[PDB]
Amino acid sequence: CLNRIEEGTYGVVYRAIVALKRLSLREINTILKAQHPNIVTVREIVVKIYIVMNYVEHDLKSLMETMKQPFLPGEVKTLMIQLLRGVKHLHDNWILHRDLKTSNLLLSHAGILKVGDFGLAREYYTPVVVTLWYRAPELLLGAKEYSTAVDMWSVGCIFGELLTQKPLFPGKSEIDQINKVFKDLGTPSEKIWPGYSELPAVKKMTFSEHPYNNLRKRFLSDQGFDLMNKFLTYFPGRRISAEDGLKHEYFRETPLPIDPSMFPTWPA
Amino acid sequence: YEKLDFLGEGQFATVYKARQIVAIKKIKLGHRSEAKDGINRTALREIKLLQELSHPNIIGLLDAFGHKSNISLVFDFMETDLEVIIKDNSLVLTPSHIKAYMLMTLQGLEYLHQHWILHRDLKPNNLLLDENGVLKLADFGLAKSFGSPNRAYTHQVVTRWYRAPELLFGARMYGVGVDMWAVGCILAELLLRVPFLPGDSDLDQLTRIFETLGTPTEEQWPDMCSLPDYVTFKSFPGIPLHHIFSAAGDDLLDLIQGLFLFNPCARITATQALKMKYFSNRPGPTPGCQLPRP
Amino acid sequence: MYHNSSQKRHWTFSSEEQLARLRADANRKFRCKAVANGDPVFLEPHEEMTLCKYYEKRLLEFCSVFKPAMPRSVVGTACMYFKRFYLNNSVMEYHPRIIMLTCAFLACKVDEFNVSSPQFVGNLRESPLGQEKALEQILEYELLLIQQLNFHLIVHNPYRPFEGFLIDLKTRYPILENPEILRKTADDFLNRIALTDAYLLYTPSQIALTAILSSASRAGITMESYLSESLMRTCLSQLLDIMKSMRNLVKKYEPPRSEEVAVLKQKLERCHSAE
Amino acid sequence: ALYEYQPLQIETYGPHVPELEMLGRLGYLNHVRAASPQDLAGGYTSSLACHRALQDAFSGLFWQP
Ligand SMILES: Nc1ncnc2c1ncn2[C@@H]1O[C@H](COP(=O)(O)OP(=O)(O)O)[C@@H](O)[C@H]1O
Ligand SMILES: Nc1ncnc2c1ncn2[C@@H]1O[C@H](COP(=O)(O)OP(=O)(O)O)[C@@H](O)[C@H]1O
Ligand SMILES: [Mg+2]
Ligand SMILES: [Mg+2]
């Protein structure tokens, strides 16, 4: 071991170049089942239990914290392409990650985004998952069942963070998070959201009404707005998927996705 | 101090036995930004708090040796926790046992609150039982002093199961009530052997609280709306207290109701709780040597 | 509370003789250690006291312009830590500058004044290299200060007792028309008590009462009736004698001399460079 | 073995401070900052601040090392 890169609640990672994460069966099985170029590649398993991974130089959140100019649209689009490929590979393997955030996203010098942190991933459930700043409204309102829409929301929020280098909904509290989502997007309705009244939170609580589609003032192309609204579709069954998002016309625009190799360098 | 056994690991630190038999809690460094801070703030807080405290029902800090990297604390060996007693189905909890546990907890909190200090982390596994059945509070990482209208700390301190509605509604400033509610929850657990309000989400926790004890009104909470995280609720009738705890007597029902008022100011304190008729009523609380042992 | 606290049990002394003998013991111990390691370069204990007073004033100035604003409790705790550390240690071993910096850092940590290390050193009038070097020395010496304080990290200051006595005078003393006009001057007197070693000899309640009564006497207002009746014969005499000793200590204190502190600083740098 | 409450007693080495329940009766709370309704919601009253100030004012006032 060389140095502890960061500390975690249920696992701590050291640099050695490889990464040695000390922690169980759920995480290792999920990480093994999803080998991919855009997914953290486990090299071997050693014994406390340790997992050896291919070392990446940086993560997305650290890069955002220590850089002043905004992201250029081309590398945003390239990172979205890589993220969508990864989440679609996870979906094909019947894997729900539920822990998609900029901290988990790892970016190397070669411009390759390689997701990890499979502690919260499961085979498809658990009522309370996903961080508050990226959790979907369905799990916020106590939905006992959920699907790929929970990862789709996290991807959309990560896109919103990419656009402005600031979290879209950094709610101080769960009630504050719900209020922020309702204010920025507009409160849902039964006509907009079928099965609204069935949600446990609405049955036992009351919220405030807000005008619809207030997120546009915060920010992106018109096709970018269409794809963003595809991320912020309230209805879980209507929300777009990664496969269709890859097919969207926003990925073919004037700032075409630059290749991963042409990435401006940053301190290591 | 010859390390001889491993006693578990948490998020704050790692604890292990040593030869009188003691337990060392060695603190691991925090995050990357927290590694540059030096000695962990939780460890320093606990050091000062247990250095200024002395009571038979408060855990005793003995030594705080360490090195440059981090710090390590030493405490008396604490045989078991209260959560082990509760979760063990082979242990029958007679009303005298509940009375004795509540008495020890309330006396410890009385001494703690007299010195203007809030535990803010009350829950059964934090109450440690020794080989002589002397319950002692522990895990003073979140313990902070109260009384001065100058320092306000995060409301998200207690775990979701034992969090008072004043904390759940996002209160900057609070008093002893945030402890008392937790005590009541512990009491409820001792009466049911299962968590009283085992909510998964904090909003679900609020729904469980209001479904069990009824939605509060402006009569029982004069300034409930004033809180910033206040959320409106539907008026649940609330299960009557005697239905939830059938075997508990009238005095125990009054004690539970007092511990479970929605108004933190009107919620009974440790001194008031010890002065209720329940503790002086027959039967007498069990001694330390007669408490159940796994 | 103070009446059962580590400060009362360990860090309050009978008189200045104990303080002088402890400081002389520390100086002699360092001299013996140096002579065993392998004569005119060692400074006398009074010179050590002069340097300690000068760098305590420097720590006061540091905490005065600190950003974010330092609560008075934090600076009081820092000064108490400085006095406690240098009561049993020698300036010839550990440099006063880094020790006062680590005292301020530990006071910030203990008093729940959350400031990050880069934020903590952004108030330093040094180069960025100087700031990061100061950071490493502070991190090195924090545990040393912790160990030298006997892990007694809670310090009771006279500001809260001063507020309490002001409130009590407001409510239970109709004779005094307005105690508020007696605050500011007392505050100034409190500052003087900070400079001397009265923090190591008398409890904060006595210090606050002495400051209030000195402010009252300076304005000509006499309130012996407050002590006699409102506060309800040996006890009153002892309190009066304690106040007299406080005023004598305040009068007797002498500020540092510029040429003297310059010479002492040069000598101290010589000792630290040599070993 | 029954139980009957004994008020725990520790010497403050100073003048007696009034009991918490009755500070407002003598007008002690008149000379403090009134607690805002947000603090009252969480169970914080100016009585606590006044009592803490008075308790720390009279603590150790009569002590001789
Ligand atoms: N292979 C790697 N390359 C770069 N950074 C890594 C790598 N593995 C882990 N990390 C760092 O470690 C952190 C993840 O810690 P993690 O193991 O998720 O802790 P926990 O699982 O307890 O939350 C991330 O912030 C990331 O920056
Ligand atoms: N004084 C003590 N004597 C013996 N064992 C102890 C003592 N204090 C703590 N322990 C053990 O060490 C472990 C500490 O973990 P814990 O404090 O629960 O972590 P966290 O606070 O992060 O949940 C507990 O499981 C407990 O059994
Ligand atoms: Mg992680
Ligand atoms: Mg514990």
Author numbering:
A (entry chain K): 440 to 455, 463 to 469, 482 to 505, 511 to 587, 594 to 688, 692 to 740
B (entry chain J): 12 to 30, 36 to 310
C (entry chain I): 1 to 38, 44 to 237, 242 to 284
D (entry chain H): 244 to 308
Study text:
CDKs require cyclin binding for basal activation, but for maximal activity they must also be phosphorylated on a conserved threonine residue (Thr160 in human CDK2) within the activation segment or T-loop of the kinase. In metazoans, this activating phosphorylation is catalysed by the CDK-activating kinase (CAK), itself a CDK-cyclin complex consisting of CDK7, cyclin H, and MAT1 (7–10). The CAK integrates regulation of both CDK activity and transcription, as it also phosphorylates the C-terminal domain (CTD) of the largest subunit of RNA polymerase II (Pol II) as a component of the general transcription factor IIH (TFIIH). Our data reveal that CDK7 and CDK2 interact via a pseudo-symmetrical head-to-head interface composed of two main interaction clusters in the N- and C-terminal lobes of the two kinases.
To experimentally test this hypothesis, we determined additional cryo-EM structures of the CAK in complex with two other known CDK substrates: CDK1-cyclin B1 and CDK11. CDK11 is a kinase that functions in the regulation of transcription, mitotic progression, and splicing. Among CDKs, it is relatively distantly related to CDK2 (1) but is nonetheless a known CAK substrate, making it a good subject to test the validity of our hypothesis. The kinase-kinase interfaces in both structures are essentially identical to that between the CAK and CDK2. The T-loop of CDK11 is also observed in an extended conformation, pointing away from the CDK7 active site. However, the CDK7-CDK11p58 interface is more conformationally flexible than the CDK7-CDK2 interface due to more dynamic N-lobe interactions, which was reflected in a lower resolution of the reconstruction. Overall, however, these data confirm that the CAK employs a common architecture of the kinase-kinase interface for the recognition and activation of its substrate CDKs.
